[PDB]
Design a protein around this motif. Structure first.
Motif, PDB file in Angstrom:
ATOM      1  N   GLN B  10       0.773  -1.371   0.186  1.00 13.93           N
ATOM      2  CA  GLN B  10       0.008  -0.002  -0.235  1.00 13.93           C
ATOM      3  C   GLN B  10       0.930   1.215  -0.029  1.00 13.93           C
ATOM      4  O   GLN B  10       2.076   1.124   0.373  1.00 13.93           O
ATOM      5  CB  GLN B  10      -0.951   0.148   1.321  1.00 13.93           C
ATOM      6  CG  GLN B  10      -2.070  -1.048   1.158  1.00 13.93           C
ATOM      7  CD  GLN B  10      -2.127  -2.263   2.040  1.00 13.93           C
ATOM      8  OE1 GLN B  10      -2.384  -2.138   3.278  1.00 13.93           O
ATOM      9  NE2 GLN B  10      -1.193  -3.154   1.542  1.00 13.93           N
ATOM     10  N   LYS B  11       0.311   2.289  -0.483  1.00 16.40           N
ATOM     11  CA  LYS B  11       0.909   3.514  -0.323  1.00 16.40           C
ATOM     12  C   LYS B  11       1.788   3.952   1.052  1.00 16.40           C
ATOM     13  O   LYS B  11       1.277   3.258   2.230  1.00 16.40           O
ATOM     14  CB  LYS B  11      -0.034   4.874  -0.911  1.00 16.40           C
ATOM     15  CG  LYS B  11      -0.950   4.408  -2.019  1.00 16.40           C
ATOM     16  CD  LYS B  11      -1.408   5.672  -2.838  1.00 16.40           C
ATOM     17  CE  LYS B  11      -1.418   5.398  -4.236  1.00 16.40           C
ATOM     18  NZ  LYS B  11      -2.583   5.548  -4.668  1.00 16.40           N
ATOM     19  N   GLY B  12       2.617   5.050   1.022  1.00 19.38           N
ATOM     20  CA  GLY B  12       3.047   5.221   2.199  1.00 19.38           C
ATOM     21  C   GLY B  12       4.095   4.131   2.878  1.00 19.38           C
ATOM     22  O   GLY B  12       4.666   4.190   3.908  1.00 19.38           O
ATOM     23  N   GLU B  13       4.369   2.920   1.932  1.00 18.28           N
ATOM     24  CA  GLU B  13       5.262   1.980   2.507  1.00 18.28           C
ATOM     25  C   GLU B  13       6.127   1.748   1.363  1.00 18.28           C
ATOM     26  O   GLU B  13       6.511   0.479   1.267  1.00 18.28           O
ATOM     27  CB  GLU B  13       4.172   0.713   2.768  1.00 18.28           C
ATOM     28  CG  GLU B  13       3.408   0.671   3.824  1.00 18.28           C
ATOM     29  CD  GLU B  13       2.479  -0.361   4.061  1.00 18.28           C
ATOM     30  OE1 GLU B  13       1.667  -0.783   3.322  1.00 18.28           O
ATOM     31  OE2 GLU B  13       2.753  -1.103   5.188  1.00 18.28           O
ATOM     32  N   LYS B  78       6.793   5.794  -4.462  1.00 18.73           N
ATOM     33  CA  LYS B  78       6.745   5.421  -2.970  1.00 18.73           C
ATOM     34  C   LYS B  78       5.157   5.247  -2.845  1.00 18.73           C
ATOM     35  O   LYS B  78       4.758   4.760  -1.548  1.00 18.73           O
ATOM     36  CB  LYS B  78       7.436   6.564  -2.237  1.00 18.73           C
ATOM     37  CG  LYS B  78       6.884   6.394  -0.726  1.00 18.73           C
ATOM     38  CD  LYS B  78       5.664   7.297  -0.422  1.00 18.73           C
ATOM     39  CE  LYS B  78       6.255   8.443   0.202  1.00 18.73           C
ATOM     40  NZ  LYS B  78       5.300   9.081   1.313  1.00 18.73           N
ATOM     41  N   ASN B  79       4.223   5.413  -3.580  1.00 27.37           N
ATOM     42  CA  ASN B  79       2.860   5.412  -3.424  1.00 27.37           C
ATOM     43  C   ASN B  79       2.318   4.226  -4.503  1.00 27.37           C
ATOM     44  O   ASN B  79       1.000   4.354  -4.817  1.00 27.37           O
ATOM     45  CB  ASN B  79       2.181   6.715  -3.620  1.00 27.37           C
ATOM     46  CG  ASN B  79       2.212   7.698  -2.595  1.00 27.37           C
ATOM     47  OD1 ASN B  79       2.382   7.208  -1.315  1.00 27.37           O
ATOM     48  ND2 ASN B  79       2.412   8.976  -2.824  1.00 27.37           N
TER      49      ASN B  79
END
Lengths: 4, 89
Positions: B10-13, B78-79
């Motif tokens: 998922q995003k932010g990971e 990154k997203n």
């Protein structure tokens, strides 16, 4: 070491 | 051996991995997974393991460009929800  | 890696996250990971210049025999001028975030989608998946050479990510060919360039390639997505990499174990 800056993780991507 | 070459292998199409698929990291569904998922995003932010970001992804949780560290790459460096392929100083090895130089089978393919790419980067080397010198480190990995034991906890992120990188370790969770398993398809990605230290000591592997990443060629291209989601189409972004790395075989040829420096390390700083590659880093930009990954940090850029990154997203993303699915990382389709083509690395060689």
């Amino acid at each position: 070491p800056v993780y991507i | 051996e070459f292998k199409d890696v698929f990291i569904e996250k998922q995003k932010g990971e970001i992804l949780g991995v560290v790459i460096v210049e392929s100083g090895w025999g130089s089978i393919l001028p790419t980067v080397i997974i010198a480190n990995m975030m034991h906890g992120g989608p990188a370790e969770k998946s398993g398809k990605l393991n230290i000591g592997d050479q990443i060629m291209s990510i989601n189409g972004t060919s790395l075989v040829g460009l420096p390390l700083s360039t590659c880093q930009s390639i990954i940090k850029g997505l990154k997203n993303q929800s699915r990382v389709k990499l083509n690395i060689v174990r």
